[PDB]
Amino acid sequence: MEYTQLGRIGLKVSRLVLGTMNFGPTTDEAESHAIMDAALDAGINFFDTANVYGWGENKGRTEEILGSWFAQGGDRRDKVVLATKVYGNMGLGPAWPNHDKLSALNIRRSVDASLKRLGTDHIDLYQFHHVDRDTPWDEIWQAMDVLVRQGKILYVGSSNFAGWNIAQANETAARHGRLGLVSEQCLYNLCERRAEMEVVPAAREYGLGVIAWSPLHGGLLGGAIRKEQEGGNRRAASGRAADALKDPQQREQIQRYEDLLDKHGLEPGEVALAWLLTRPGVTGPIVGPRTADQLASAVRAAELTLTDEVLTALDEIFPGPGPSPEAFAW
Amino acid sequence: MEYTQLGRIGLKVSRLVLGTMNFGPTTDEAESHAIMDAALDAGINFFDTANVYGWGENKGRTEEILGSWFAQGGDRRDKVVLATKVYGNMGLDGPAWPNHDKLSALNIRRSVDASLKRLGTDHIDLYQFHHVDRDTPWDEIWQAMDVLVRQGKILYVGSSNFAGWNIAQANETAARHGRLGLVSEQCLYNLCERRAEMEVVPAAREYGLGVIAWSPLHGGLLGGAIRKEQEGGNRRAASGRAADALKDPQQREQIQRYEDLLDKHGLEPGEVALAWLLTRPGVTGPIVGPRTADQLASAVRAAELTLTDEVLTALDEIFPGPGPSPEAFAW
């Protein structure tokens, strides 16, 4: 397993991050535990979760499933960089005021609930699930600093920010000696490359890690066409993946992709993961296995070496915009 | 004429900015001078130029045309908010001698002196970075700009062709030491190119910069370029961005739908494109690029136009925009 610094900070992380969103809705508790043990054995030390994971009436069950994995002992908590999230609504449409978003009030109650469900006295990387345009950064950093100085959190990260939100957050932190965002968790894969325009350039300038969520675009990139005939699609049958397959242009993009990999004898989920590991500034993908065999597939992807010929072919099927301002001006 | 504050600062500007890029290579000195006179009489107090305008062997020619305009007296200099730019290469077109382009303190020093001499004035009101320079750090840039501010050679600093995050970083760096940051960003924004909506304009609004849109007609493409296609002359639409766009069928189809839609409503295409930008949140105004006195008078009419809800939603249907990031590509 390959390791790297999370951006500028002293934390060392595997280049595969174990995403846990499937643990609960799609993967049951015992198989989730087995995937986590296997991730440790493979050397993955960085787990991503969220308070909202679990779905519906079971929002929080993913954190509880990690809670019960830690509670088995065997140094599991001490070996894992534990990341979770605040912002989302923990109830079932419109949230009660200040029971979502990034007000200091919601941060206080959400961290306590997450810490209770995880059965740990601290979160290593506490992440904003989304930018909240209504909460100023001096409020946010007050809230996080209270938790840092109490020992309840160590690091702060962002998710689904714009590039200028990262700049504003970390400049505001720096004014008063505070450690800023250490990482941005953004959507980035072969199908969706617009994080290249500003999010990733800004993350690189401010020395944040970049960890890519839905690195297979919700399963689209892991052989979802091939699997339509055999009914192997689960997550790839809803959400981003199903919407993309319904669109003729996007579907044919995936078709050329699966065909090209057939010619080269490569697995499509592994190529997509390995492709992110080549992108400048990307710490690594947050893999989303539903089975232990999908985790092992991800582990093999971390060792894949893509040829320049495949890389340029993938670029031709899935072009990116590159950085702003050049992406749309000159 | 409608006026507004330039973002957060005390400067008041007309919602039309006179672009001068045509003055020299496309419009001769005499028509250039009459456009500016008509612009002043219309109430336009905000002029944008650059050291490189004039093109080719005549880079600098535009600044000189503005200089001989000012030298006529008549309160012209005192009345005009004068903006020029630094970054471009001023030598032989081709690879620049090191530090004769970009935003080193060295090039800023030599460029502003040469602009002042050609403009024949002792100060520039709005000195703009023509493009982001990823290799010059902001404490170097702001040192160079502040030297000029304290000498009285410039008043305000602005940006052009920045990423939203460059705006944040520039103004956070300026604010740490009590300097006035960027006051405006000059970005490509029109009906055909809306991606400044993702992060440039949101960042500019958060930091209280003016937003002034260059090539607001996409270089002539939205000026009735199809209807006038087989016409001739020195039309800006007959080459560059507008021509290349008309040879792509998808882009060409958009313009066709647009000109047809405006026939149905009795509206001029050039005028609608300007009026449409004036409705966009955070936009100070377009930088209009008249070739002729009559195109300027037409720009002035566009600032009095009131587009209906019906035309706006139809314009959206032809030219959809992405919205802000991250919602534009994530959720």
Next chain:
Amino acid sequence: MEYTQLGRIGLKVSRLVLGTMNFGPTTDEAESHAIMDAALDAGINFFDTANVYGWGENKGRTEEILGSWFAQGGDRRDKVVLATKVYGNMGLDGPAWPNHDKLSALNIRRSVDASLKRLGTDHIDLYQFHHVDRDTPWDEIWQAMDVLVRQGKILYVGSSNFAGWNIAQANETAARHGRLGLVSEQCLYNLCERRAEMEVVPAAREYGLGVIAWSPLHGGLLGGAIRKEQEGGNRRAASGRAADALKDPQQREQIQRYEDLLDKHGLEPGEVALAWLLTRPGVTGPIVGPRTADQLASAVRAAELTLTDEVLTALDEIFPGPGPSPEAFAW
């Protein structure tokens, strides 16, 4: 016993610092406790340890031995300035699990709780970075240290095996936000190894840090290791730094001339090495490394020694220093 301030801060320490690295692997618990009783009896109030001391499968034993010493009551904890360290890997062999070594806020959090538990105390007086960690930035480091300061778990932060510029960067970073910076640097400094004079000690003096010299006998090399090679008696001087040095003919001759020189002046070689450090400008004191009670008594006599200008000049001839940079390699 002579006392001095630790660099610029209000803390007063004896100029002999008790090192404990031998306590466990080389000196058993009973003799380690006797050595500590006798150090307190001689007025030594400043003890240096580390989480890794104990070796191999017994990393942590040295801290546990101090813990059981403090547990014997008698004002011991209250009387001693207790220093320990974080950075080292606590596991047996091979590369550490990620973030179970080095200076991330994550390892700092877990290392100080394990140290506090082994030491059986609610605070460490001087919490030291065992080594520079080039991968952790200072705003992360000072965040984790400031958490412990405000909780009352540490009082003071120090460095060890830093470069001079790390010292400067650390304390400049702390001072920008009203944090007390590093209060001391623990660096290798003795007759045999003098290159800390190039830049580490100068930076430490500029920033007002104490300087406490580890392996002040160069791992026993300077305590009569050649004589004891035939009489028997080398333990620590049989391995590591000292064994390597004697494997080199030029370094072995330095030691020979050293022991010859002191035979003639009637002086003990370990005592001269300690006393020489006490003369070096900026040096708070040596961290003595006694293996036995009698080696501690020897160290205490060395703190009363006075080395003549003749001896000092002879030692400088045998063991030349580089002096400060840039003069050491340039002019």
Next chain:
Amino acid sequence: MEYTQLGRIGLKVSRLVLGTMNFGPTTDEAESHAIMDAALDAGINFFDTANVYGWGENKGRTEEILGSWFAQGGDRRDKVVLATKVYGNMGDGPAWPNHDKLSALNIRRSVDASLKRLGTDHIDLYQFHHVDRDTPWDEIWQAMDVLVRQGKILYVGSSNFAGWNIAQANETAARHGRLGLVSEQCLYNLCERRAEMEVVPAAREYGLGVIAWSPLHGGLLGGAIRKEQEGGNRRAASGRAADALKDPQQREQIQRYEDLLDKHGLEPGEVALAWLLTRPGVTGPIVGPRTADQLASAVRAAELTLTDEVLTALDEIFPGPGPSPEAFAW
């Protein structure tokens, strides 16, 4: 000609810096002018001089030689990044108090005398010739900021600093908005590598350029043994080169070096220049041609590509210490 950024700042410089110390005492004015013409023709845009160059009674002659070179028009001043120094006594022996070192008083008088000899209104890179332990950085930066605001200088650089002087200087400048040191000029070559302990690592941390002076160790690395018997006005017959040849251990090193290059068919002056160009953090060497052909030789050196065998062999003869604390502790 290869160009690079001078450390972190926006200034672009040729990786060969033209040193001028020979111009006056060693190379006459006509050939000095000729060397400068050749340097500019080869694309070198970065010249180093000092107020004291000229030596003895003729301190200032080098700046005067550059002054008359600029006066021959040709876009010369506009094209050259012009660098000189302050610290040295301009009156030889014990200096009148405040007529050497870095007091605000000596800085004021030295820069005016330098600007007059150079016949220019501004110095692009004004460098401290040496650390001055008796002047504090708030006084130095006050003096330099007066010059920046009057437009008499653009950039400040250091020379013969310790690494910790660099950190203290730039931390002090950054505290109050000032651009700190942009470059450090240090003794660094195959024979003298102790800048690797702390000077160069500190420069790299603070984003300083690194330009090495006497990159052939005063001619010692330019073929000095092959040429030891020949007469003439050779730098290698005097100064530090001659002292090293009288030490047996340093002569043997040069012998092995010259012999090694005989077998590979390489020129010793060019190899040493090319070697510095491989060192991480190093902007470039400050070449010290005595003749126009020695300049052409330096230009070829910047195009040489040393092989790993040669690099390993050079490391065997000329071992470096590496960074502190590892170089002496662990």
